[PDB]
Design a protein around this ligand. Sequence first.
Ligand code: FAD
Ligand code: FAD
Ligand code: M9S
Ligand code: M9S
Ligand code: M9S
Ligand code: M9S
Lengths: 487, 485
Amino acid sequence: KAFDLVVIGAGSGGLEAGWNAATLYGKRVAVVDVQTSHGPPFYAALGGTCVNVGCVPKKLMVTGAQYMDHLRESAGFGWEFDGSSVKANWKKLIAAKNEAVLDINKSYEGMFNDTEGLDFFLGWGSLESKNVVVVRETADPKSAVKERLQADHILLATGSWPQMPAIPGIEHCISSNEAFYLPEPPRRVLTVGGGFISVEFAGIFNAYKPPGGKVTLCYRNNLILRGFDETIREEVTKQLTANGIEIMTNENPAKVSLNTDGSKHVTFESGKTLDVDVVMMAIGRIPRTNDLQLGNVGVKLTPKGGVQVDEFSRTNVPNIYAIGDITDRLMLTPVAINEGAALVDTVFGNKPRKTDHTRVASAVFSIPPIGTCGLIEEVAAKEFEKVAVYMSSFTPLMHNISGSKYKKFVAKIVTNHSDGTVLGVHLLGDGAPEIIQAVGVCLRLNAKISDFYNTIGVHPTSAEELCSMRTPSYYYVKGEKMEKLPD
Amino acid sequence: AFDLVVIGAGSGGLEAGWNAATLYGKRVAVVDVQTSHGPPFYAALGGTCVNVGCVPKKLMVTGAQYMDHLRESAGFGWEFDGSSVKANWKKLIAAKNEAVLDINKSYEGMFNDTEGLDFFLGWGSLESKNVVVVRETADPKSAVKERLQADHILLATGSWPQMPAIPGIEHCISSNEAFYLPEPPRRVLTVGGGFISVEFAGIFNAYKPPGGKVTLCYRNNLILRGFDETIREEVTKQLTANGIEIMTNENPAKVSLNTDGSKHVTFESGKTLDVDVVMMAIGRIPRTNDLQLGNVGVKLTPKGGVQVDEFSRTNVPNIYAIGDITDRLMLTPVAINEGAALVDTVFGNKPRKTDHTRVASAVFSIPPIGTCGLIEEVAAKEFEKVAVYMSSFTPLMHNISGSKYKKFVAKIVTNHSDGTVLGVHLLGDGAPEIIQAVGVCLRLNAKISDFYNTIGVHPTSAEELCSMRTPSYYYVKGEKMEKLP
Ligand SMILES: Cc1cc2nc3c(=O)[nH]c(=O)nc-3n(C[C@H](O)[C@H](O)[C@H](O)COP(=O)(O)OP(=O)(O)OC[C@H]3O[C@@H](n4cnc5c(N)ncnc54)[C@H](O)[C@@H]3O)c2cc1C
Ligand SMILES: Cc1cc2nc3c(=O)[nH]c(=O)nc-3n(C[C@H](O)[C@H](O)[C@H](O)COP(=O)(O)OP(=O)(O)OC[C@H]3O[C@@H](n4cnc5c(N)ncnc54)[C@H](O)[C@@H]3O)c2cc1C
Ligand SMILES: c1cc2c(ccn2C[C@@H]2CCCN2)cc1-c1ncc(C2(N3CCCC3)CCCCC2)s1
Ligand SMILES: c1cc2c(ccn2C[C@@H]2CCCN2)cc1-c1ncc(C2(N3CCCC3)CCCCC2)s1
Ligand SMILES: c1cc2c(ccn2C[C@@H]2CCCN2)cc1-c1ncc(C2(N3CCCC3)CCCCC2)s1
Ligand SMILES: c1cc2c(ccn2C[C@@H]2CCCN2)cc1-c1ncc(C2(N3CCCC3)CCCCC2)s1
């Protein structure tokens, strides 16, 4: 049992690395994971966090939640039906999501069965020595050895895990992992955190809650979605509120106790209280380092806690590499994929390649959604003497007719005003995740604002607003926001 | 005494007029036959796109998409009384009419509030090289209202539905009248394979009353000529899957009235069909007849467009033509771009010409199309080595929604000598929005490697464009083969 590559973690990065090494370069590859399909007790599984308890099921569930808006919005276009007959069956949503994820699990299991030199091992991987991965029955080092895999190269690709704050009654709370399997939709739920997971699940629960229900999102600071464009952070807050979600800023739970009926009594640091049926912690995700026994071989962590790597994903230990969320950088599936492919090209393909972590496009599947690529203006204004911001914002016509007039589309382009180079593009509104993909290609080509406004529009779309902005709306000069340039 | 007289207050004409008055302080007259949408002349102030084109058709396709949303919601756990469901066409048209009227009124205000920018109601024609006559009707013998003296004349009158010369053609409508049908037809035949026929087949399919049937006929073998061929076949299948009957290699030979007022269609093959509405959508032709072009000698192309050069100049010195009347790319953003460039050149001292290559466009079919640049059989004739990248897949949601037939198709066509992307063709939800920034990419001469070294946004349909690294097949000297020699 002597492999060219042993991958610990059969997820977005690990599977891309293993498949490429086996099929592009003829190498003998072992991949370790703890389950062959989604769900409790370990949640993630073959396919990784995105497939099993991440991007794939959450996108299905947001899609389900959007029908609340569609069914109401249809009336402005003449659709008539018994509005009081409308009900949402949560069990059906979960059951259908489970079937779709399981189809992917089954597909990947067929990939392993049929692909030469690509072998799957069920169990918990850890480092025994610099060239041996041990696979045990459980995450505990005292559990029994199942096999010892001799490895010329070892790839750490175990992902991240939900961070749970140490408050009394944390044990009465859940994370996103369990939210994917709730037996009933909560009539009242508190999602804790201001990041994409809290926001995305707020909108899911808001659509499936039974009558008399309320979704509350809380966030420790003043404005949700830190790191996103500030106009969009503010507009999403308004459009969430408009759809019935209570957003509770500058608040943070201090404890949770059980009510007589099994509901949860939340007390915030402020002294406020709230009764909910479910408390979902989504305050962050931390690199999954705890079970690998990295200290056995000396693999170093960063001051933040991710596995430390260079730009070629090398740890401090020769022939041990790390990619994806365990490196605690950009926690995105396509970045883990790109890193895995680059690693295998370099190590086995005599084709050195490194992942570019700038100008990466990403999305938030709030309702409506966010699509973004590159720098927000605050960040550009620190790196560039003259920054211009082009901004267009409006409720689309379709949504004046639908009756969802709160659904303002936002398009913003951030440039280095010295040569017009586009530094960032930020979008809020229907179709934004789809619009922004090719924008990432544009930024990788160093597009300037004039390449956008001299491209002929596609009409009628939201995307054509990106090609309709010729004149800055305002500027940052040496960090100072101002409407007109000096002089 | 006008710097510029514009005949046609549409997409191209209003952009030229506004820019000439507000950017360069010029004195501008703009003529159109109606101040607000609808019968009898359909187009009006704002043009075809505002009144009976892109804007109302997009609203109506959006309405039609609810038929799919209501049905697909069930797979995600939504229930409601299906027998209570009605698609109320009258409400749809009423909401659309008010949206269009709002824009009509906005442009009316533009004219009332902008100095140097003046509107004249009536029919414009060329009396002489420097005079536009405005009459009460399209009849050249109708009464004169105004005679506008013009340093420069802009022909921007658009295009008009083509109608075949068959007995009974008068009982057939065009897209113009479809926007104003008082009731949704139970049985409709749309005639033609182009985008308007396809888009309206989807609209009628959603709003038809019980017992209804939409039939689309096309005189040749495969609809949507000029679009990527993989997409033509697959959109045919997905229309069929949603209950539309596609009747290829058929063409109406005559139409008569049944005793209930419905239409009896006889095809050249001798087949017959009874329908409530026959909608002819076989083409749009440049709208030249009423302009009395023979007065001043403006030359036409063999196919009826006003001949222009790259700067939109006719053969008569201070007479120009933009938009659909030039019979090139009949798209609103192209007409807008031609108008703005023309004004920059004539009045701005910055010669600008419209680039008509690599223009992104869409079809709001259900499912929709997004396209930019060359299809592969055209590229194969201009380039010695062509690579075609192709991916088809089912979006995640349609493993749940009950609409398994909704395959997404992504195709990239390149010059295989240097990897330059010559065309991108998309079929599936999101495609019109995806393709806009693809147009920017092609203007930057993106190569295929620029797409596949860009990191995906996940999960989206658009990331498929960044996930194709190896040609599926090639054309070498115009010959299709799976592998290069
Ligand atoms: C709710 C949620 C939504 C998300 N939505 C998006 C989205 O829309 N878009 C996006 O790009 N990203 C999204 N992400 C992030 C994305 O899921 C991750 O960035 C991606 O999965 C990281 O891939 P990875 O290869 O680093 O590890 P993972 O994909 O997490 O795979 C790691 C694997 O390691 C296994 N494992 C762990 N410990 C061991 C061990 N000791 N031995 C063996 N196997 C082990 C786990 O079972 C798991 O299968 C989301 C994440 C979450 C939680
Ligand atoms: C059903 C349909 C759907 C369409 N959908 C799209 C789409 O989604 N996207 C897209 O980009 N394009 C679309 N188009 C095409 C778009 O409408 C045209 O390309 C665009 O309007 C052309 O602009 P123009 O300046 O050439 O003329 P138009 O906008 O057609 O304006 C011409 C104007 O001239 C007026 N007029 C005509 N003759 C005279 C005269 N003698 N005197 C005075 N006034 C006169 C007419 O009333 C009209 O208002 C669609 C067209 C149709 C018919
Ligand atoms: C599935 C199933 C597969 C095989 C091979 C055999 N069977 C089973 C067969 C299929 C038909 C009948 N039974 C391969 C697969 C793959 N799915 C995805 C794969 C990619 N990535 C690599 C890792 C996960 C992600 C690489 C290729 C591009 C897309 C992403 S490889
Ligand atoms: C299936 C499915 C695949 C992909 C890529 C994406 N999805 C989609 C699935 C859906 C969920 C997860 N991803 C690839 C496949 C393949 N099937 C067979 C393949 C091989 N040969 C190649 C020629 C025919 C035989 C390759 C060599 C080893 C096995 C045989 S590659
Ligand atoms: C288990 C196993 C599950 C699935 C779905 C699939 N598989 C098995 C998969 C597929 C084959 C092998 N792997 C879901 C579950 C659960 N859903 C809810 C669970 C409970 N709690 C609430 C959620 C967290 C824990 C409530 C219900 C009673 C038990 C505890 S356990
Ligand atoms: C409307 C209405 C307008 C005015 C001016 C006054 N009033 C009436 C007033 C305004 C406040 C209350 N009522 C202007 C307009 C215009 N609408 C669109 C115009 C643009 N394009 C040029 C024309 C064709 C389309 C101009 C360039 C930007 C893009 C759109 S100009």
